[PDB]
Each structure stands twice: as C-alpha cells, then as structure tokens.
Design a protein around this nucleic acid. Structure first.
Length: 904
DNA sequence: CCCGGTATGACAGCCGCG
DNA sequence: GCGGCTGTCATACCG
C-alpha cells in the first residue's frame, strides 16, 4: 500500500513523524528536515519560482529549522518580505507525501476513554488532581476491545470486583444493561492500589499509543487529570511518558471570560468529541453533557443511578464501573451515526495537515492553496499582521409586520463562493479602483458603467478578467470535485438497481466476482456477462457497490464544508490571503445582487399582473428572497382550485416557466453591467407557503427582521403529504425558551396558519386552566452563564446585573456551605426560574446547572415559591402577543380594538 | 487564528412630568 | 416616582 502519515511534530531542529509504512506497520522516525524559504531577487536572476503577483524569487535552503526561523526574524527587522511556508511541519508533509493521500483507517489507532474520580467535595479540578482515579475505561479501535482498569481500594472505600455476569443481566434482574454487542469485547483489570493501576495504564499506553485520542470532555478533564495525577505521585518524567516523544506542554486557553489550561501531548492528535460535535452538528443544544446528547442522537434512555455521584462507588460499585463503560460506548455509538472522526480524517489528509487543525478553517485552506501553488512552482505570500476592522456585511430587508397568505421563496446557490468566481476576487487579481456612486444607484442601474475592461464590485474594486485568480481557481476545483463525486455515487446507484433483479434469476456454480471499478458504471459488454453468474457472488458485488456509494457521498460532503468555510477564512485577519477590500467586495456585491433581483422580480410581476408600484418581494435576507404570491392566486381566483395540491402545483409551474427565466435574464444583465468574468448568480425556487384550501388559516406572518413562520407544502419540488412548519428566529426555535412552552407556542403557530382565529382562542383558553400541572423542567428558561464574577459583590448583585446571573447569586446563597450540592461552572448553561415576592432568598429568581434535576436541598421550597403567573406572562403570553399583533389576530375572547394604538 | 447583521430581555442614565 | 425614549450589555439567532 501507499505510505501515509499519522502525527507530525517539531521539536527544536528536528521533526518527529509517526507514520504507516509500505507494509502496514506503524513506525516512527526523526528527520533533520532541511526547510526552504524564498526572497525577492533581480529580474536577470533566473529561477522557476515566482510569487502569486508574478515577481521572481530565489530558493534559500537552510541547514536546519532554527536557521530558517532566525532568518525570518531578520527580514522583519530590515523591512522586507520573507516568502514561503513558515509552518515547516506542513512543508514536511508536502514533500514526504507529494501525491493524493489514500489512507486506511483500520491502521489508525483511535482511542477514546473516560475516567471516573470519586470526589466528596464538589468537582475534582484537573489542575491539582488530588483525588484518586478509581476507574479507567479505554477503547482501542484496532483491538476492538474495551480495556477496563478498576481501583479496588481507596481512601473513599474498599470494593469487591466488578461482575461481567451481573453487568449482562436485565435492569429488573439486578441492573446494569451492558449490551450484548460489547460484552464479548470487555477486558477487565482490577487493582489493589492506585499506584499499581496508574503504572499499568501507562505501560498499556506505551504498547497501544493512540494516534487519535477522542472522548467526551477529554481535553478539559480526562487528559489533564490523568497527566497531573501521575505527575504529582510519580514525577514530571513519568507523566511525560504519555507522549510517544516524551514531550508535553501546558497551554493556557484564554477567553474574554473564564480561563482554563490544557495539556498538549506531542505526537498525539486529540479530537475531543464535544468540540467535534459543537462544530459539525450545526444545531444548538440546551445542554452539552454526554447524557443529553446520547438522548438526542441515540434515543437511548437515562443511565440512572441511586443517590449522588460521589457515593455511587461506595454504595453500588457494580453500577459505577458499568456506568463508566457505557459512557465510552455512547461516544462510540454517536461516531457510528455521525462519523465526525472519519470526516476530520478525510479532511486532514486532503489538505495535508495535522488532524487537530480541522478545528481551524484558516489552517485547512492555508494548506490546500499551498499544495496547489507548490505544484505550479509558485511561492506563497508571507503572513502579514493585519489590524482588526469590521467591514460591511449582508443586506437584510425590513419587512412590514403583517400576515402573508401565499409566499414563494427564492434562494441563490452558494452565494459567496459564487461571487468570488464571478468577479474573480483574489489578492493578486486587483486590477485597480473606480469612483463609486451610492449602492442604490447600482441597484437601479442609473450609475455609470464602472469599467469597460475589468470585472467590478460596487465597493470600487476592479479585478482582471484575463487572469486566473488563485482563490477562484482553488474554489472552482472543490466545486468541480463536488460535481465529480456525483458522477461516482449515482453510477453505483444505477448499478445497484439491477441487483435485486439479478438475484431474481440466478444460476449457481462458483463464486466469480470480476474485479472492476464501481465508480464508473458498466457498459453493455460488462452487464451481459455479470447477471448470468452465481447467486452467492452477486452478494459481494452488491456489498462493494454500496461501499463505493457511501464513499462517494462522504467525500462529497467534505467538499461543501470546504466550500462554505472559504469566505469566513477570507474575512479573518490572520489568513495569509486576507485583504480588507476583497472581503468588502464579496459582501457588498451580495448586497447589490439581492437588491438587484428584488428590483427585477417586482418589475416583472407588475408587468404580468397589469399593476404599477406594488411590492411583491416582502422580505430578503442575504441570499434568499420571499415573494408574496397573494395576487397571483387572486388572478385566477381561490374558488377555482379543487384541492390544496392544485394551487401549489400552479405556483410551482409559474416559478419554473415564467419567473425563473425572468430572474436569469435579470442577473445576466447584472453580469454585463458589472463586466464580470462569469455569470454564476443562479437562483432557484425554494418553498411554497400557504393555508389549507377553504380554511380560516393565515398561511404565514413576519414580525420583523429574521422572525417569521410559514406553512410549507413544497420545498424544492418535494411535495409534503402533511405540511411542515418553517419557523425562523421565533421563540420556538430558541434554546432560551422552555420545552413545554416551546411545544405550546408551536401549536399556537400551527393553529394560526392552518386553522384560524377560532382555534387559537380555543387553545389558549384551555392552556390557561391547565398550566400548573406540567413539568417544572419543561417551564424553565435556559441561558449561558458568563462573567458571574463581574457582577459578584459579596454574593450580591452589583451594577446592572443580568437576570440569569441574579439566579446564580441566589443559588450560591441557597447552597452556601453545602459542597455536596452541584456547582455552576462558568460557560456551562443554567435553568432559570422566577419566584414571587416574600420568597426565602432575597432576589426574585433562582438558577441551577442545566441538563439536570435541581438538588433536593432546595427543590422542597423552590417548587412551592415559584410564581407561574409571572412565568406565564413572561415566557408564553408576551411572545404570543408578538405573533398575534403582527398577524392581526386575537388570542383572547374580548380584546378591544382601541387597545392597539400608540396614542398621545 | 469562521464572517457581519439583528433580534429580545433586562437594567440604568436622562428629561419632562403640577 | 411615573412612564417615556434611548444607550448599553448579554445572549442567541439568520445567513
């Protein structure tokens, strides 16, 4: 097989690489790497190396990496540019792997582990690590085994051995429901003291040194706790043995609020799944504890235990160990469904970077462009310390707060990457500048044509049309690769169809699966002598066709992620190819494009309806526009459609045949007016919105910018049998809103758009009488807890103290002394509840750590003292009025008409 | 060392309030 | 104070 890397590090004047060799073995090597950096030279001096601007450069080979870094330092002092890759690790990978990397994940040791630490006095801080580690469950992907280390004797109790027999039994048979899938794969190792346990795990660690280290909160707790515990007991030198290169660095992660420290293990790529989930899941959650996420993803219920956490090992050591094994397994169960590790591997080897850096879109792109330019014998620019300044952004239309019965949305495809290609925006394609008129004047096409020869942006930027931009070339590649992997995936789908028919008429003799590539579809010469073969062989041919099918999609998704991350990289001052004027050009063009087409959609729909000056486009956000279809329906009349599906079909056919060409014609004009390189402003129909036919529903409503609800029947030519609610920005789509309220508001919204005013009033009136009977967790608001110490004056609220913080300072007075009680960690979110006047606290709200039941120490009183009326008025009624006043609806029987005016 | 725009809740300075 | 209008911070959303 072709060789590939695992981890890369720079220690002094030598790089340390762990890799898989040509024969499958995991090997390690030290290289006195000889880097190269580039500098400007005279024209007469001949080389093959040029920079992105076209200027000539000379290659300067250094004896060692220190000489290379000391040289850049000198170039800074005198005021000249030092060209080339200054991250010598990256340059090493590029040299040693100067080809498309193909990796075998089976060879990659992916370890995920969780530790248990019994701590009677609150949370065990990892920096001190003063409490014994009484359990370690470590899973090795190559071994496919769970390695369990269980401390039997500690200051906090002596326990019997854990029973794998009992851990297999049912929950009603004696607890612990460790699944049959993993019961065979557990290796259990008991220990008499802590020193024996830690020294064995460290020996185990040498034998099975992880390439990828994963788990939940592994980098902020498990790693630094294990490291510090070993260190404090045995010494620095024993603790540094966790690194295969025997080197560890303490890194202090700094925020603007709440600081912590992490342990870097050189030669190990740590992918903490919590951070991995927070990045790629693209959905905000009320709690980021493992139990809440397992609940969401796997549907699997609560991993319950009796009593507190600190007394679980003492009271039920049997469950304690099982709880730890399953915790590891639930992370393994998620990665089986989301595949976030294989995704970050596939992204890492593509860009030729160390895997940890996939948390940085900056580092990823910096290396994708680097590799392509190096292939052309081109030299990358120097990192330039740019100052921070917030440039303009996207256009947002202020909508008139009203009801909207029929709506058709239209969306642009990958707007910002598309702009970059269309205008040919790159740091090295800046042709010049022109004097600009107000944006409005470019939107209505009254401002004079910017340039006859150059591609233009409304902010004044001109770009060459004849050049091939470094940025646009590299994004078109990813765009072509996305398009190419459709060709491979859909080919396997066409080949997979004639397998159930191939197995329907078989003839068995000998298993003969012919070795052919599944990425390219078979011809009539291959299809003929492939269905007359054996029945047993067709099973493996389908197995490999599906293996290739998913493999095409996996690579396809990794390209869209790369597509959507480019703009964000170009807007960051730390990016190598960052240019303020370029970012503004990308963004301001979008502002114009959206408002241009809005101006063209209105002009068109006025011609075909025989009216003038009517506003059809109600709302437009960044890349999408929303068209009021009311008058299109009113043109042919509502009482001429037979069913709901009939008018939806009409608006679909109208967009396809009449509107889309009008849109396309308008953007072509915008391309010529701007004199752009290529027309790539493609806009297509998104959602058709409205109420059921012959119903009292309102179809949809806006309340303001980024706050609307629609009843959608069709999304991009996909007809829903039962209509879906597309609510955006409203209280139902916010993690700050209580769970029972979240569902009750959505029902109110549902009754508004589909059923009418009568139904809303019927639902609200009933919800009034039957409110206090619901769950207290489902009626508690969620908010992040940042800067608690900022407003903390002796446990009391200081100047301008927030409402969620006012609950934490009420919490601290409630649990004063009790260290058995749970603590509020900064950053971690909190459940907020309001309590009426005369309460036994001081203030008017209390808050507790989100994702859990509130402690029994204060649940006695809080559940009694909390005012539902205030909680109803603040989280349900006040938002409800927001919807109704905008929709021109009433939730209550008799609300006077005159109580809507602002008056004197 | 992923982008800017924009909402709601909540508190606090400030101006006119017989 | 009693409300009104407005600047401010904290938070969380939309692309």
């Amino acid at each position: 097989m072709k060789e590939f890397y695992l981890t890369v590090e720079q220690i002094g004047d030598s790089i340390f690489e762990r890799y898989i060799d040509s024969n499958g073995r995991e090997r390690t090597r030290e290289v006195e790497y000889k880097p190269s950096l580039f500098a400007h030279c005279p024209e007469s001096q001949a080389t093959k190396y040029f920079d992105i601007y076209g200027k000539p450069c000379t290659r300067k080979l250094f004896a060692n990496m220190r000489d290379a870094s000391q040289w850049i330092k000198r170039m800074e002092d005198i005021g000249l540019e030092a060209l080339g890759m200054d991250d010598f690790k990256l340059a090493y990978l590029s040299d040693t792997y100067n080809y498309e990397i193909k990796y075998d994940h089976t060879k990659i040791r992916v370890a995920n582990f969780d530790i248990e630490v019994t701590s009677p006095d609150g949370f065990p801080e990892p920096s001190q690590a003063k409490h014994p580690i009484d359990a370690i469950t470590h899973y090795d992907s190559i071994d496919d085994r769970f390695y369990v280390f269980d401390l039997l004797n500690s200051p906090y109790g002596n326990v019997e051995e854990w029973s794998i027999e009992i851990a297999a039994k049912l929950q009603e048979q004696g607890g612990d429901e460790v699944p049959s899938e993993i019961i065979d794969k557990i290796i259990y190792m008991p220990f008499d003291n802590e020193k024996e346990l830690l020294m064995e795990y460290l020996n185990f660690w040498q034998q099975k040194t992880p390439v990828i280290l994963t788990g939940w909160n592994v980098e902020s707790f498990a790693i630094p706790y294990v490291y510090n515990r070993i260190k404090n007991i045995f010494g620095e030198s024993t603790a540094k043995r966790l690194s295969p290169h025997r080197k560890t660095r303490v890194k202090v992660i700094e925020n603007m609020y709440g600081s912590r420290e992490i342990i870097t293990l050189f030669g190990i790529s740590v992918l903490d799944y919590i951070d991995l989930y927070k990045k790629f899941s693209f959905t905000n959650q009320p709690s980021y504890s493992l139990d809440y996420i397992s609940e969401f993803e796997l549907n699997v219920g609560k991993l319950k235990y009796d009593g507190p956490i600190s007394k679980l090992r003492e009271s039920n050591h049997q469950r304690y160990i099982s709880y730890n094994i399953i915790a590891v397994y639930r992370v393994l169960q998620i990665d089986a469904k989301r595949q976030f590790i294989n995704l970050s591997l596939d992204m890492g080897y593509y860009a030729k970077i160390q895997i940890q850096s996939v948390f940085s879109p900056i580092k990823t792109w910096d290396a994708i462009i680097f590799n392509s330019l190096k292939e052309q014998n081109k030299v990358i620019p120097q990192g330039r310390s740019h100052p921070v300044q917030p440039y303009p952004g996207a256009f947002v239309k202020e909508p008139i707060p009203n009801r909207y019965k029929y709506v058709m949305s239209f969306d642009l495809t990958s707007l910002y990457p598309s702009i970059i290609r269309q205008v040919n925006i790159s740091p090295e394609t800046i042709a010049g500048t022109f004097k600009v008129a107000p944006l409005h004047d470019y939107i209505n096409a009254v401002a004079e044509r910017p340039s006859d020869v150059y591609s233009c942006s409304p902010n004044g930027m001109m770009y060459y049309k004849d050049r091939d931009g470094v940025v646009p070339t590299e994004i078109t590649k990813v765009f072509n690769q996305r398009k190419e992997h459709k060709g491979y995936m859909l080919a396997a789908q066409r080949n997979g169809e004639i397998i159930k028919e191939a197995l329907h008429n078989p003839n068995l003799s000998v298993d003969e699966p012919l070795d052919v590539d599944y990425r390219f579809d078979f011809s009539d010469e291959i299809k003929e002598k492939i269905k007359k073969l054996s029945a047993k062989s067709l099973n493996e041919m389908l197995f490999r066709a599906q293996r290739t099918e998913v493999a095409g999609m996996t690579a396809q998704i990794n390209r869209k992620l790369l597509i959507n991350s480019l703009y964000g990289a170009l807007g960051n001052v730390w990016f190598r190819y960052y240019d303020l004027r370029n970012a503004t050009a990308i963004t301001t063009f979008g502002q114009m494009a959206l408002q241009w087409i809005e101006r063209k959609v209105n002009e068109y729909l006025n011609e075909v309806c025989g009216t003038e000056g009517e506003a059809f486009v109600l709302y437009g956000d960044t890349d999408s526009i929303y068209v009021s279809a009311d008058k299109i329906i009113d043109k042919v009349g509502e009482s001429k459609f037979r069913d709901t599906n009939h008018w939806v079909d009409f608006l679909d056919k109208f967009a396809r045949e009449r509107m889309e060409p009008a849109i396309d014609r308008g953007f072509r004009e915008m391309c010529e007016y701007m004199n752009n390189k290529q027309h790539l402003m493609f806009m297509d129909r998104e959602a058709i919105a409205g109420p059921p036919l012959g119903s009292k529903g309102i179809g949809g409503f806006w309340t303001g910018k980024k706050r609307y609800a629609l009843n959608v029947w069709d999304m991009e030519g996909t007809r829903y049998a039962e209509p879906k609610l597309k609510i955006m920005g409203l209280e139902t789509q916010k993690s700050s809103t209580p769970k029972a309220v979240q569902k009750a508001l959505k029902e109110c919204i549902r009754r508004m758009l589909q059923e009418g005013e009568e139904s809303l009033q019927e639902y609200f009136k009933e919800f009034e009488k039957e409110f206090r009977q619901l769950n207290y967790i489902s009626i508690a608001s969620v908010s992040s807890a940042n800067n608690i110490a900022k407003y903390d004056v002796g446990g009391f609220p200081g100047p301008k103290c927030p409402f969620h913080i006012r609950g934490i300072l009420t919490y601290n007075r409630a649990i004063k002394g009790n260290i058995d009680a749970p603590q509020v960690v900064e950053g971690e979110k909190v459940y907020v509840l309001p309590l009426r006047e005369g309460n036994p606290f001081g203030d008017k709200c209390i808050a507790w750590p989100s994702g859990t039941e509130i402690t029994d120490l204060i649940k006695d009183d809080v559940l009694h003292w909390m005012d539902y009326t205030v909680l109803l008025e603040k989280t349900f009624i006040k938002p409800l009025e927001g919807f109704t006043s905008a929709a021109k609806l009433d939730y209550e029987k008799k609300a006077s008409l005159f109580d809507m005016f602002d008056f004197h």
